[PDB]
């Protein structure tokens, strides 16, 4: 019974921790021509035959709202975009009076504007033309005199014409001494214990898809719609709804664009929209009516379990386009689609969409980007895998939320927790040093 202290090293125990994770990818199928920002060539390959260890007889408390993997992913993305755009052409020389008239889409939103631009030789300026979308241009006068919307606030960096921003699944992997725990309870929602817990080197690939009302291309729930919130009784919180069935969206940019290269300096090129070829048509997105109807009704049914009120949906209440419309990127183009027909037969719901080139991503007002035009036509296929909803009676009203991108990552990282291994410990034995 005369038990003594014995030191054991290599004890299989852990403590919660916050550390630096690294970027890893599955495929190295990406070339150097595309220069995808998520194929940085600074991101390592992951394990082609990854292991997962089931931890039996353990319980672990997971919390998607206080999870630090989300903050780190958010930070990495902002940093990545700023670095990728760092060396590219600045468009401050374009903050000149624009002489604009409507394009010959006559008997809307595209303006034909004239500029006075300094050429490679500083003594001369050339008069040139470009087409702009109405959303990017603000009038100065009541006359045909306009300015770009950013000159009032910030300088524009032109997106690098050779850099793809197409999402590539990224795995976030632990550094030595750390491990990632995964929750395998199919019905795990927000915060609380998970009974089926396993250990992995790293997460599944997560596509860094940016959208504001409908979450796209994520992972579906295994059995039913799962509703996740930090505090479901707080109307100020976002409710993340994970669908157990996807709904497809077909989006397009139906007019044929051309690209006009304008020199604005000594090796400094500006890419302007050139003439539109053929008909001028409005951008749009197609959602099957029958799939949407059953999906939205199932969401109302599941939401009801937490409120016991009749649930209805409404169009968003207002704000700028990033919040009021379904903002998303597709093909490198930036779409803002009107969803009033969703949040409200056998037809297809066709949502009109608008497109804009001068962008202030992640609410970082003061850092504008110009998205150069893409020649030809654009066709997108995507999956709605979830919704971001907010709330305002014997009824309750839900509206699209979004804007703050961390909510789009909590929806994939809710299953993961980072812990550190603390292998040194003590237990009793009759064994003594001598």
């Amino acid at each position: 019974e005369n038990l003594w202290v014995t030191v054991y090293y290599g004890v299989p125990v852990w403590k919660d921790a916050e550390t630096t994770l690294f970027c890893a990818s599955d495929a190295k199928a990406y070339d150097t021509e595309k220069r995808n920002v998520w194929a940085t060539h600074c991101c390592v390959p992951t394990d082609p035959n990854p292991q997962e260890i089931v931890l039996e007889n353990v319980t672990e408390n997971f919390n998607m709202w206080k999870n630090n993997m989300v903050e780190q992913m958010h930070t990495d993305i902002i940093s990545l975009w700023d670095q990728s755009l760092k060396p590219c052409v600045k468009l401050t020389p374009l903050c000149v009076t624009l002489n604009c008239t409507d394009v010959n889409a006559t008997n809307e939103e595209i303006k034909n504007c004239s500029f006075n631009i300094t050429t490679e030789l500083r003594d001369k300026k050339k008069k040139v033309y470009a087409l702009f979308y109405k959303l990017d241009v603000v009038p100065i006068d009541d006359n045909n005199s306009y300015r770009l919307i950013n000159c009032n606030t910030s300088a524009i960096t032109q997106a690098c014409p050779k850099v793809s921003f197409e999402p590539i699944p990224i795995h976030y992997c632990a550094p030595a001494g750390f491990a990632i725990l995964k929750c395998n309870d199919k019905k795990f929602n927000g915060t609380g214990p998970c009974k089926n817990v396993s250990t992995v080197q790293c997460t599944h690939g997560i596509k860094p898809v940016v959208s504001t009302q409908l979450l796209l291309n994520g992972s579906l729930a295994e059995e039913e719609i799962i509703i996740r919130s930090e505090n479901i009784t707080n109307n100020a919180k976002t409710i993340i709804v994970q669908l157990n069935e996807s709904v497809e969206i077909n989006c397009t940019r139906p007019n044929n664009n051309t690209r006009k290269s304008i020199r604005i300096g000594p090796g400094q090129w500006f890419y302007a929209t050139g003439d539109i070829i053929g008909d001028i048509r409005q951008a749009h997105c197609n959602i099957s009516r029958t799939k949407w109807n059953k999906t939205l009704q199932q969401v109302a049914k599941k939401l009801r379990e937490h409120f016991n009120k009749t649930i209805i949906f409404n169009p968003s209440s207002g704000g700028d386009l990033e919040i009021t419309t379904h903002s998303f990127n597709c093909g490198g183009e930036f779409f803002y689609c009107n969803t009033s027909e969703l949040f409200n037969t056998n037809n297809t719901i066709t949502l009109p969409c608008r497109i804009k080139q001068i962008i202030n991503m992640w609410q970082r007002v003061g850092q504008a980007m110009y998205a150069p035009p893409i020649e030809g036509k654009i066709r997108c296929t995507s999956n709605i895998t979830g919704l971001l909803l907010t709330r305002d009676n014997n009824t309750e009203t839900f509206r699209p939320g979004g804007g703050d991108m961390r909510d789009n990552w909590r929806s994939e990282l809710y299953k993961y927790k980072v812990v550190k291994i603390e292998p040194l410990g003590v237990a009793p034995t009759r064994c003594k040093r001598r």
């Binding site: 014995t6 030191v7 090293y9 290599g10 125990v13 292998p423 003594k432």
Partner: protein
Amino acid sequence: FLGAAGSTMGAASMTLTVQARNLLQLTVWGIKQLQARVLAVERYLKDQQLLGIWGCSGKLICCTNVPWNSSWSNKSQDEIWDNMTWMEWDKEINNYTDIIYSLIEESQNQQEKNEQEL
């Protein structure tokens, strides 16, 4: 790796060599990883230094002086090594971690190094 986390404390003694084995441009993307590498080394060395102080540098299982307090644990070995897991154990001892380490360090070294020269 942590396969033994759900196993009992005794059984888990076979994996000490597993748990103890995986401990080893100018941009933020890169500097944060360099900092992580330096930290991994520092954490490794701190554990090795402490084992050296306790006279446990070459051992995964190291018996020391310092008997157990009933205030730390009054549980029999029948449960500790045969039924409990290491996580469960850590949850019972935790508060005494610093106390035990201090007692080992301040006893085991002074009472051996002098006696050996003499």
